[PDB]
Ligand binder design. Structure first.
Ligand SMILES: O=C(O)c1cc(-n2cccc2)ccc1Cl
Length: 133
C-alpha cells in the first residue's frame, strides 16, 4: 500500500519554468520546443514491490519499472542515459538521476487532488501539476 495515493492516470494541467529546467539539464533547442508543448499522461501502477511509471504524449512514450531504493538504468525522454534511484521520503517519491557527473532530482507529491512534480537541477526548479485523468 506504499504508493496507494499515487496510483492512477494523471494528466498535465500546468507547467512553470520547464523550458529553463530543460536548458539546465542540457536539452537542445528543437527538443525543448517540442517537448515543452507535450501534455503527458502519467500512469502509475504497483504490482507487489514493483512500481511502474509511464509517461505518454505526442513527444515520447516512456516507461520505467523499479523497486524503491534499488538503482536502475533509464533512457530519459530527452535521450540521456542515466542511473536512477527512486525512494519514498516522508510520503514523497524522490527520483535522482545521475549522468556525466551531473545530477537532477524529480519529486512527486500528492497535494489535495493533484499530483505535483518538482524537477530541480542546481538552482533551477520547475513545477508540473497533474490532475486525475
Ligand atoms: O515524458 C515526460 O514527462 C517529459 C520529459 C521531458 N524531459 C526533458 C528533460 C527532462 C525531462 C520533456 C517532456 C516530457 Cl512530456
Amino acid at each position: 500500500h506504499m504508493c496507494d495515493a499515487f496510483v492512477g492516470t494523471w494528466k498535465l494541467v500546468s507547467s512553470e519554468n520547464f523550458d529553463d529546467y530543460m536548458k539546465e539539464v542540457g536539452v537542445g533547442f528543437a527538443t525543448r520546443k517540442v517537448a515543452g508543448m507535450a501534455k503527458p499522461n502519467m500512469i502509475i501502477s504497483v504490482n507487489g514491490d514493483v512500481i511502474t511509471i509511464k509517461s505518454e504524449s505526442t513527444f515520447k512514450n516512456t516507461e520505467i519499472s523499479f523497486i524503491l531504493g534499488q538503482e536502475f538504468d533509464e533512457v530519459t525522454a530527452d535521450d540521456r542515459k542515466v542511473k536512477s534511484t527512486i525512494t519514498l521520503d516522508g510520503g514523497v517519491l524522490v527520483h535522482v538521476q545521475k549522468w556525466d557527473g551531473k545530477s537532477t532530482t524529480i519529486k512527486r507529491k500528492r497535494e489535495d487532488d493533484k499530483l505535483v512534480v518538482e524537477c530541480v537541477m542546481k538552482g533551477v526548479t520547475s513545477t508540473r501539476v497533474y490532475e486525475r485523468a
